[PDB]
Amino acid sequence: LARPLWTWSPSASVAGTGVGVDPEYVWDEEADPVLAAVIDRGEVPAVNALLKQWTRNDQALPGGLPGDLREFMEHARRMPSWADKAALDRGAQFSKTKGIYVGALYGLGSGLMSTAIPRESRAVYYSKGGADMKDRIAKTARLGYDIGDLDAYLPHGSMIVTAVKTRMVHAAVRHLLPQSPAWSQTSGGQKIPISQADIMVTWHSLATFVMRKMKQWGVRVNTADAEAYLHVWQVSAHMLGVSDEYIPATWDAANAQSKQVLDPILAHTPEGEALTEVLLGIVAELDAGLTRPLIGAFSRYTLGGEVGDMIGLAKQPVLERLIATAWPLLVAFREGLIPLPAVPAVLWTLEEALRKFVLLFLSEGRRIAIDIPDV
Numbered sequence: 001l002a003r004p005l006w007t008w009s010p011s012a013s014v015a016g017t018g019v020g021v022d023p024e025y026v027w028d029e030e031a032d033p034v035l036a037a038v039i040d041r042g043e044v045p046a047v048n049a050l051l052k053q054w055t056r057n058d059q060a061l062p063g064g065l066p067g068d069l070r071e072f073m074e075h076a077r078r079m080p081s082w083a084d085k086a087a088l089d090r091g092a093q094f095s096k097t098k099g100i101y102v103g104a105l106y107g108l109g110s111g112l113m114s115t116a117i118p119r120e121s122r123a124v125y126y127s128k129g130g131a132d133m134k135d136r137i138a139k140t141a142r143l144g145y146d147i148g149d150l151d152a153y154l155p156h157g158s159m160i161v162t163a164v165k166t167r168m169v170h171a172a173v174r175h176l177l178p179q180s181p182a183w184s185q186t187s188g189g190q191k192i193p194i195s196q197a198d199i200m201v202t203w204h205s206l207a208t209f210v211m212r213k214m215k216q217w218g219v220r221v222n223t224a225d226a227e228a229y230l231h232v233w234q235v236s237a238h239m240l241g242v243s244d245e246y247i248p249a250t251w252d253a254a255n256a257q258s259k260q261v262l263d264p265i266l267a268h269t270p271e272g273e274a275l276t277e278v279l280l281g282i283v284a285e286l287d288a289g290l291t292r293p294l295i296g297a298f299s300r301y302t303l304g305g306e307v308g309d310m311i312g313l314a315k316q317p318v319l320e321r322l323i324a325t326a327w328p329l330l331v332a333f334r335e336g337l338i339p340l341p342a343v344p345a346v347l348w349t350l351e352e353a354l355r356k357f358v359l360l361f362l363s364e365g366r367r368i369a370i371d372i373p374d375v
């Protein structure tokens, strides 16, 4: 009669109005047919070589693209009319100021959580025409870093480039994955992967999750910075091809949506299990000092024991209790709110290992080109 409105109601969205179409059955109407044609015409190797040259937001598209793709890209690179440059700048500055926390949350928190999102785990696991498993999951764990880049939407930055290339990658995947019998057979009846709804689930595992955890830890998030961070994520969802009718307009909307669309779908899968082990291995192999028990303990603290158990993160009760008691003290100290706290030495070691992890994930994604898959 008049209590919970549908989570996909356009009423709580950036568009604010619209017809009301279930995003489970919406993909990318503009990109999908273009990428299907590019792949079917055998144009992927040439297109990748042309697009390798397109690296900065203010750059003209390389000459020589197929006309349909050129037209798509010229449209896709446009910022929405509701993008606010000042807020975008503020959100980028906030992300940098709080970089150890955001970077740790994206890399460990959202990256490990992704192995409990069955559709994302299955798509990544079964995708064939890009790079190897190890490279793929490392790139999955780095989602958030490009969006949160300090220069993301400036003329010399690259997030428009990254967003447009990602939109094209996803569109290619939608043409490719249904041709994989292992993907089709495990898809639970979804005919085409990476629906709008699926993108928004993943978005909640990033934006909404990171904000929640920063606030819980006592990071100083004033209202204006919270709003600017949301704005970065809203504009980025649009540039990835999410219709404005599905992007939450406010934190209240986003927080309520995450509870309904992300929390209930988290599940262990065989594919996700494989990916968790690969990611845990990748992180432990970095020159960061993140040992398996530190990763486990900090990730369980970050995700909670229910999700940690679902993923299979081994129990570290001594370190988890040390972290729960003292990590908020380290945060308060770094926020300038308390004098230097007497905490166990391993807290400072953990903090340094997280800082080196974040720097390594900043270093690695610098300059890597996003290629369209084929085959």
Ligand code: HEM
Residues within 6 Å of the ligand: 119, 120, 123, 124, 127, 128, 129, 130, 131, 136, 139, 143, 144, 166, 169, 170, 173, 193, 194, 195, 198, 199, 200, 202, 203, 206, 240, 369, 370, 371, 373
């Ligand atoms: C906010 C949401 C998302 C972001 C920011 C995002 C980002 C990206 C990026 C940057 C790439 C390019 C990887 C690279 O080559 O460097 C990519 C590729 C891919 N994405 Fe997403 N994605 C999102 C949602 C999804 C969802 C919901 C799915 C699946 C249900 C998905 C499945 C994939 C697949 C399968 C690839 C190709 C991987 C490969 O073969 O290398 N993505 N995505």
